[PDB]
Amino acid sequence: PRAPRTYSKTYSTPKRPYESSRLDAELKLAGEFGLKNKKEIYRISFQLSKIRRAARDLLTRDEKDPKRLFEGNALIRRLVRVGVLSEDKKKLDYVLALKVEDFLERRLQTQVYKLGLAKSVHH
Amino acid sequence: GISRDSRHKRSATGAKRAQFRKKRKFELGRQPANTKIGAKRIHSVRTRGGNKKYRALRIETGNFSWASEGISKKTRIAGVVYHPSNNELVRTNTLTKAAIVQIDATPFRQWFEAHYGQTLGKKSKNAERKWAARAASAKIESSVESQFSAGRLYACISSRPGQSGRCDGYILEGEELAFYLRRLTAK
Amino acid sequence: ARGPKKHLKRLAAPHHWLLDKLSGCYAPRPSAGPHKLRESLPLIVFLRNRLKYALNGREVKAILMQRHVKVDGKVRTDTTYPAGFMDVITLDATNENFRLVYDVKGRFAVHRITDEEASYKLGKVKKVQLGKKGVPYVVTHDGRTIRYPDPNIKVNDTVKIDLASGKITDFIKFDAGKLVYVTGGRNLGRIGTIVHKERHDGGFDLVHIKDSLDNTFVTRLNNVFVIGEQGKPYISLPKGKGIKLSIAEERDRRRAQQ
Amino acid sequence: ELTVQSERAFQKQPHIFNNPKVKTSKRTKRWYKNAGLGFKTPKTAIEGSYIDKKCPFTGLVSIRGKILTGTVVSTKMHRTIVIRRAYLHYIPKYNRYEKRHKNVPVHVSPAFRVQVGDIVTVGQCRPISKTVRFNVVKVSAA
RNA sequence: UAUCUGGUUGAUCCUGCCAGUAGUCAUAUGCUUGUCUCAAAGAUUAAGCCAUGCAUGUCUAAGUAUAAGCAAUUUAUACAGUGAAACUGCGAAUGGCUCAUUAAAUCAGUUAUCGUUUAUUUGAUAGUUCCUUUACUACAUGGUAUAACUGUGGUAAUUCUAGAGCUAAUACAUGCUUAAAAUCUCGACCCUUUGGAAGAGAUGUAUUUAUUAGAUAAAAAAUCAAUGUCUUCGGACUCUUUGAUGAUUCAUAAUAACUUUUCGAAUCGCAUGGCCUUGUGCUGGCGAUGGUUCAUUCAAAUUUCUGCCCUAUCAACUUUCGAUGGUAGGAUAGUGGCCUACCAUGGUUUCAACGGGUAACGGGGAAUAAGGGUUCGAUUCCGGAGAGGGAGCCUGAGAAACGGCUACC
RNA sequence: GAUUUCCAACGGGGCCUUUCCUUCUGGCUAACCUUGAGCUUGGCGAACCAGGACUUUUACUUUGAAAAAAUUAGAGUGUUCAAAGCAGGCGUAUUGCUCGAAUAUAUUAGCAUGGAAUAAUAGAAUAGGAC
RNA sequence: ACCCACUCGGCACCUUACGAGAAAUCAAAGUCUUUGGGUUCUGGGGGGAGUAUGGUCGCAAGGCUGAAACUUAAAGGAAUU
RNA sequence: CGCCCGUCGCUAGUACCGAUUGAAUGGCUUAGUGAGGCCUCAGGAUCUGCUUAGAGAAGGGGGCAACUCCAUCUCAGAGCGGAGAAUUUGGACAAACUUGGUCAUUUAGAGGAACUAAAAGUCGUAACAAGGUUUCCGUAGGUGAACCUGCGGAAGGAUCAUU
């Protein structure tokens, strides 16, 4: 028997899946960005919460410690390379304020729309 | 067969330790050799990783040494006199380690006569000069000289007949001779 | 269990081997030889995954059986020969030898050496006394015994095996200012000098060695290897001579280069 | 006890023999071996009359291994003493220590005098009996 | 991502539980079920029972080839290529499956073998083996049986076998064969006995013993075994050799002998050169196999300290017949009551002994939480037990081996 | 001018303050009266060791060695994304070059090092107390 | 024996709440979400049930230890109309 | 014109006791019987080597009449050995069988005495007000039933007040 493979869930079910305001927020986001059933919305929320918690833990550490420093630079570099992080503002603090808006912006359909190649999110 | 495990042995606290594994090959045990006095016959026994053991039985002759003077010769076993373990080995007249046993002492007497030129209490100029040079050492203590005059000596066995396959011993002398003489005379 | 094992799964293999995690199900179990299998480097994995002159076990077996490899003198034919540390391995003609030496990351390097480097070698002794008929002999880390050594040779020294006549060309006394390769432990592949070794009367001697760039770290005496004098190493060091350069600035250096 | 030669056999140091034809003092030569690890053999062991093949000072038993201290609680059992070990067990859950004790039997040479209460130090040695595996190498009397 | 809510009530505030909620390498089931990658899968109750198939055999240039097999030699008339079967040497003690038993037991962290064994690969490592040693002696390499095969068959049947004829070993069983010196013994001989010798035997390992050593803090002065070295024997003699560990009766060496006598090449394939002299005379590599020990590795075996669920509606347990230690001996490869004969009465325990259950193999780990914490872990990695319950044993370095046997259910 | 003359905070080392803050047999003597005119042989055995006279135990804490993988966090990487995996990238590609395959986690028990802040143990009292 | 002033050790009493408590009330029920003085015992929804059984003491009635199966969504405490 | 209790009747389920020298499963061992392998005491079928040794006599070398020297198909007999099976005197491992003892889990059992479940059963009104005899807690009796009574105690009383 070979070594088992590693798999992890890419989404996180919210603690309260039965309420009004959250549902309104998600439904509006899906409608105005052209998405399928909101499994990817939950996935994006999961990854955003993960990186936000990582950034909070990094900010907890004291300044000039290489432990904190090199992970902070690596995370900032990866996030700004992805593009959800604004190039002008990168101080390990704007990551704690970034929302799912930029992550959904970086999708192929929204990029095509805002470039002007399909004229519609669904198209 | 016989096993040397500790699982069957009761624990220090006194609890009956339940069995865990069956008896293993590497921890087996064989029967006592019980080397009697009789016709020479040794059977080889295969041991873990080779190294066949010489299971002696009914030995005829063995080697005995004279640590006080330092000569070793082959003498004949006569009989066990007393065993510090217990008396039934002597009663059976069987040979074990650390057992006091009479020996022929005949080649020892021949060596003394041919090497020192004097008798132990009952021609060649090279022999005479050798004895003269080796003088001032012919004195022998009372117990050993009396035993030599009477014949058979007392020897204690050092080798293990079951493992070695042969009997090797040394003549008693001094404090151990006196102690063992007292023990055997107190009868 | 009830006898020595003859197999080893591909999870318990040493991490310094640097082998593919799945790559099937099994891993090459080294055969009995000079070095221990846990700190070994078999020719199978070395020529299949670390140097890339073959594809699979059949090919590498064919390359060893063609009398092309000349491991430590004799040609050798076993694919799972346990080639350890500080051992030269001649590869037929055109002079590639690549003596096995640990890198700074703890694994093994492929640093190429020259003809004289392959001709000579250094081995650390571990046990010395006289044997049958009173012939003194030294047992090196490789495992070879050399009869009638220099009387000045003592425990924890390093001798120079010529590999042609089987005698000691020279020896290095274990004292201060000796280059150490640190064989084993968390400091694998490090290079340092001897400054002070603790007595450690109970056992497990350790020495607080010092890297060139003022890095002081202590390693057990059983995990040291005298490779030469100060500033004058007796072996061809690979790139990154035990620098142990820190993570952030080595990343900075690699991005600057790229 | 006082007389070393009390058993049926003639116990003596193996391979140790004194010439019956000589006069030199002490007659039988007493072989002694240094214990090591900063342990000093007592003066009584040098001139003692016992044999005690299990004693490291005058026997083949080595004191290789670890050294641990203890307090003697029983001396009735012959040629040996039982020491009580006091150690604290830490429970990570409660962040408080647990009082625990262990009784390990050890072997004491006749040269050392041990009572109920004094401190002893015992080092590892080869299995002497079923349970005892340590030998007394130093005693601090109270 | 340190959070809630509905419910006793005409109505209020508390304790309190029930339910809703989310997750589960946690399962089972119902409704459906287009596509890529990936993957668990008779563990939960029965470690219950199994029809039928397969899963351990193996040949290189280099152990044995008269197959009544296949062909070819043109290098060969003793043999050469391939090659069934078989003998021989190894492997079958690896791997795979399950977690029944097991609660200081396994196991994990961490130690020791100065208390043991070890095929295998790697590196070294036998000038002595004729012992009335002038015949008792093939060392140009010697003895014997046997497998396959050819004929007789028995049985209904099985990896069933008996008689006849043969034949080979890297099959069994024997066996000698190379310079010397030094050192020990006996000892003629000369005896001028300061005293010196012809001569002979002994002189490698493996085993059994016993002894001497195996050293190794500084420094002086009168005398003795026979003057020892060499001399006015007044006496000078200083030089003196010894490895390792914290530790040794350590490694090692020398003596006196011992061995139903251990080894010290009666083996195999290629290539073809030199010395004379023209003798199949004498010297000549690559290796393979095998071999006596030591080291390394593969390891195995015990072993130091700590750590394991719930129960006192388990308070004393063990100690006849082994229990806690010693003395001496047997067996093991080794230390050890592992067993034996004697002696002493001892050993653990409210700091949870001992007994009971575990629907408990342990660990590495998994699920779930601000922190703490709770539950699970048979299962892809390590270690441990098992081949239906026991118990015994051969071979084998390594097995109480079960796809190895014997005995009872 | 990132640096020296630095003025302030911060933890460290040695010495004097009755405070040996374990010490004796030898190699060299260290801080050296060694004297050379200020490199000239010996200022005081630790400035370097061999060693030996003794070490009350601790509980605790700091650091460190050793701590097999997968698995946990997590670096790098266009497996088309991702689950992943441990590759790949760049060419003059007729010849080839080449970065990587990290870094941390390891409770408790065991081993070594600085502390006597806190919590116990014993010393000398009809003195056989120490010099 | 009385009266004035002080003090220690007790039975206690009255107005208030710096505070506690769900309230009734408490100078201790306070110094407990600003959570840690030392220490023993008892309880985890109401019934079953202080029952059965296993032990133990007692002449006896009974005393000590002490469940499980099963059932329910309310059993309760303080105050208000 | 509330709330609520107890006895009894009907229906189901749960648990306990219960005669049955209770029955089955597993663990441990009292004793007896006891297969088999192992180590030893013997055993000797059978095979087989060596030394002489008689042996009828071919043929040869000799005599050359007989007769002598040598092995050949063969069988009396005498020793010197080696392997050596069947069986088997003794010791230990002792599987397993019979008989019991002890411990852990289970369930059948006539009947007895309890608990619980319920929109609609009969009798009384015991408690919630001074519940119409003020309640509650121990102890001992009586009654179909809640309950009553004697003794002691408590207010959770219906009394914070007699200078």
From Swiss-Prot, chain A:
One of its GO terms (molecular function) is rRNA binding. One of its GO terms (cellular component) is small-subunit processome. It is found in: Cytoplasm; Nucleus, Nucleolus. Keywords: Cytoplasm, Isopeptide bond, Nucleus, Phosphoprotein, Ribonucleoprotein, Ribosomal protein, Ribosome biogenesis, RNA-binding, rRNA processing, rRNA-binding, Ubl conjugation. It comes from the Eukaryota. The keyword Ribonucleoprotein applies. GO terms for biological process: maturation of SSU-rRNA from tricistronic rRNA transcript (SSU-rRNA, 5.8S rRNA, LSU-rRNA); ribosomal small subunit biogenesis; translation. Component of the small ribosomal subunit (SSU). Mature yeast ribosomes consist of a small (40S) and a large (60S) subunit. The 40S small subunit contains 1 molecule of ribosomal RNA (18S rRNA) and 33 different proteins (encoded by 57 genes). The large 60S subunit contains 3 rRNA molecules (25S, 5.8S and 5S rRNA) and 46 different proteins (encoded by 81 genes). Interacts with snoRNA U3. uS11 interacts with MPP10. Component of the ribosomal small subunit (SSU) processome composed of at least 40 protein subunits and snoRNA U3. Present with 106000 molecules/cell in log phase SD medium. There are 2 genes for uS4 in yeast. Belongs to the universal ribosomal protein uS4 family. This is Small ribosomal subunit protein uS4A. It comes from Saccharomyces cerevisiae (strain ATCC 204508 / S288c). The lineage of its organism: Eukaryota, Fungi, Dikarya, Ascomycota, Saccharomycotina. The gene is RPS9A. The chain holds residues 2 to 124 of 197 of the full protein.
Curated annotation (Swiss-Prot), chain B:
GO terms for biological process: maturation of SSU-rRNA from tricistronic rRNA transcript (SSU-rRNA, 5.8S rRNA, LSU-rRNA); translation. It comes from Saccharomyces cerevisiae (strain ATCC 204508 / S288c) (Baker's yeast). Residues 1-30 are annotated as: Disordered. It is found in: Cytoplasm. The keyword Protease does not apply. GO terms for molecular function: structural constituent of ribosome. The keyword Phosphoprotein applies. The modification Phosphoserine is found at residues 65, 68, 72, 85, 142-143, 146, 149. GO terms for cellular component: 90S preribosome; cytosol; cytosolic small ribosomal subunit. InterPro entries: Ribosomal_eS8 (IPR001047), Ribosomal_eS8_CS (IPR018283), Ribosomal_protein_eS8_euk (IPR042563), Ribosomal_Se8/biogenesis_NSA2 (IPR022309). Present with 15900 molecules/cell in log phase SD medium. Pfam families: Ribosomal_S8e. The modification Phosphothreonine is found at residues 61, 106. Component of the ribosome, a large ribonucleoprotein complex responsible for the synthesis of proteins in the cell. The small ribosomal subunit (SSU) binds messenger RNAs (mRNAs) and translates the encoded message by selecting cognate aminoacyl-transfer RNA (tRNA) molecules. The large subunit (LSU) contains the ribosomal catalytic site termed the peptidyl transferase center (PTC), which catalyzes the formation of peptide bonds, thereby polymerizing the amino acids delivered by tRNAs into a polypeptide chain. It comes from the Eukaryota. This is Small ribosomal subunit protein eS8A. The lineage of its organism: Eukaryota, Fungi, Dikarya, Ascomycota, Saccharomycotina. Its main location: cytoplasm. Keywords: Cytoplasm, Phosphoprotein, Ribonucleoprotein, Ribosomal protein.
Swiss-Prot record, chain C:
GO terms for biological process: cytoplasmic translation; translation. Component of the ribosome, a large ribonucleoprotein complex responsible for the synthesis of proteins in the cell. The small ribosomal subunit (SSU) binds messenger RNAs (mRNAs) and translates the encoded message by selecting cognate aminoacyl-transfer RNA (tRNA) molecules. The large subunit (LSU) contains the ribosomal catalytic site termed the peptidyl transferase center (PTC), which catalyzes the formation of peptide bonds, thereby polymerizing the amino acids delivered by tRNAs into a polypeptide chain. Component of the small ribosomal subunit (SSU). Mature yeast ribosomes consist of a small (40S) and a large (60S) subunit. The 40S small subunit contains 1 molecule of ribosomal RNA (18S rRNA) and 33 different proteins (encoded by 57 genes). The large 60S subunit contains 3 rRNA molecules (25S, 5.8S and 5S rRNA) and 46 different proteins (encoded by 81 genes). GO terms for molecular function: RNA binding; rRNA binding; structural constituent of ribosome. The modification Phosphoserine is found at residues 31, 246. It comes from Saccharomyces cerevisiae (strain ATCC 204508 / S288c). InterPro entries: KOW, Rib_uL2_dom2, Ribosomal_eS4, Ribosomal_eS4_C, Ribosomal_eS4_central_region, Ribosomal_eS4_central_sf, Ribosomal_eS4_KOW, Ribosomal_eS4_N. It comes from the Eukaryota. Residues 41-104 form the S4 RNA-binding domain. HAMAP family: Ribosomal_eS4 (MF_00485). The modification Phosphothreonine is found at residue 114. One of its GO terms (cellular component) is cytosolic small ribosomal subunit.
Curated annotation (Swiss-Prot), chain D:
NCBIfam families: PRK08572.1, uS17_arch. N-terminally acetylated by acetyltransferase NatA. Coiled coil: none annotated. There is a cross-link at residues 12, 43, 53-54, 76, 93, 102, 130, 138 (Glycyl lysine isopeptide (Lys-Gly) (interchain with G-Cter in ubiquitin)). GO terms for cellular component: 90S preribosome; cytosol; cytosolic small ribosomal subunit. Keywords: Acetylation, Cytoplasm, Isopeptide bond, Ribonucleoprotein, Ribosomal protein, RNA-binding, rRNA-binding, Ubl conjugation. Component of the ribosome, a large ribonucleoprotein complex responsible for the synthesis of proteins in the cell. The small ribosomal subunit (SSU) binds messenger RNAs (mRNAs) and translates the encoded message by selecting cognate aminoacyl-transfer RNA (tRNA) molecules. The large subunit (LSU) contains the ribosomal catalytic site termed the peptidyl transferase center (PTC), which catalyzes the formation of peptide bonds, thereby polymerizing the amino acids delivered by tRNAs into a polypeptide chain. Transmembrane segments: none annotated. This is Small ribosomal subunit protein uS17A. InterPro entries: NA-bd_OB-fold, Ribosomal_uS17, Ribosomal_uS17_arc/euk, Ribosomal_uS17_CS, Ribosomal_uS17_N. It comes from Saccharomyces cerevisiae (strain ATCC 204508 / S288c) (Baker's yeast). There are 2 genes for uS17 in yeast.
